[PDB]
Amino acid sequence: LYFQGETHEFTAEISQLMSLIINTVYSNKEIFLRELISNASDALDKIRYQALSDPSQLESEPELFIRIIPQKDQKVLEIRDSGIGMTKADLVNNLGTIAKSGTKSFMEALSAGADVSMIGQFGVGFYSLFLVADHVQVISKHNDDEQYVWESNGKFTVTLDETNERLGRGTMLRLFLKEDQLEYLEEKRIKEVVKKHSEFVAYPIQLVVTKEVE
Ligand SMILES: COc1ccc(CO/N=C2/C=C/C=C\[C@H]3O[C@@H]3C[C@@H](C)OC(=O)c3c(O)cc(O)cc3C2)cc1
């Protein structure tokens, strides 16, 4: 169903090319944020749905939200949602994996100069993160599993989370931004991008800003 079956061994070189392709094809780099919000919206839909039959699934994190937390000190942009979350197996599948179907369609679409604006539907959207970031940490907690951290920059690694604060449920993406892409820690820019590709989202998109007072 996906490239290299599922397993990812001695294939760091591929991540560079996909990153190089996506960095060359997508000159408007703000679309990484649109894909994050779209991923988070889908995650919230799934837990809301399965909470209709079994409302006890919402007790881990009662509220359903998307939250963007720019960390100016650490040069990190954090995007958290309270969706269904990801087990260890789910993290390995969704993160860093390529689908032969999507890539073949993506590559072929590039050949004919066809509309590739919607990156998510080629199963390749993961590497849009590397448009703005040099490293990525994914913290996730699924009701049926413990909290795990997936991170790469590349070598993939899923580590049991024994340090970060506890998420009730859901996923947090920590983006270590490139030195030229720090514009995405600023409030104005974030609202600009969110306002663009977020009209149709049914969940609140919250922005946490720390400003000094005069
Ligand atoms: C910035 O661009 C990209 C980042 C990562 C990827 C590859 O990970 N793909 C994802 C798929 C999301 C689509 C539907 C989901 O409801 C299912 C729950 C679970 C499977 O998904 C998530 O928890 C989740 C999230 O809450 C939040 C996320 O940001 C991602 C993801 C994980 C692709 C693009």
Curated annotation (Swiss-Prot):
Location(s) in or outside the cell: Cytoplasm
Domain of life: Eukaryota
UniProt-annotated binding residues for ATP: N39, D81, K100, F126
Domain topic, free-text comment: The TPR repeat-binding motif mediates interaction with TPR repeat-containing proteins.
Similarity comment text for this entry: Belongs to the heat shock protein 90 family.
Role, per record: Molecular chaperone that promotes the maturation, structural maintenance and proper regulation of specific target proteins involved for instance in cell cycle control and signal transduction. Undergoes a functional cycle that is linked to its ATPase activity. This cycle probably induces conformational changes in the client proteins, thereby causing their activation. Interacts dynamically with various co-chaperones that modulate its substrate recognition, ATPase cycle and chaperone function.
Subunit structure: Homodimer.
Protein name: Heat shock protein 90 homolog
Gene: HSP90
